[PDB]
Write a structure and sequence with these properties.
2 strands; 1 chains; flat; RNA-binding; two-stranded antiparallel ribbon; Rqc2 homolog RqcH
Length: about 50
RNA sequence: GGUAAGAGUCUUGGAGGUAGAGCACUGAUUGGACUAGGGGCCCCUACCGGGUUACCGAAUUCAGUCAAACUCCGAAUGCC
């Protein structure tokens, strides 16, 4: 219920959206125009921590 | 006591909105064009807008209804 609202209302364009491959997990979005490689790594670790 | 006014009928002139009719007002309404505005869905909304709505209906309009506290009208009888 938070995820559909976050994906369709909150985040604008060119926001990197992250999810675990073929495993259910939290939906993680970075609200910046350009994501730094370190930012992508950190958000991927957060998405992996909040996963199965 | 006044006295012959009283009453009925023919003729004439009036006031007063009932029966009936009608939307010319006040409401309630049914259908079609007309669509102010609101409803989902795609481009997009971090937000302005666009499309389709076999989607509702405040306006307005062609029609169709209704009304003791609606009347543009309007009797028969009663009344003076």
């Amino acid at each position: 219920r938070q995820n559909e609202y976050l994906t369709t209302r909150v985040a604008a364009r060119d926001d990197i959206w992250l999810h675990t491959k073929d495993i259910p997990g939290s939906h993680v979005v970075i609200r910046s125009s350009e994501p730094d490689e370190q930012t992508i790594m950190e958000a991927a670790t957060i998405a992996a921590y909040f996963s199965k």
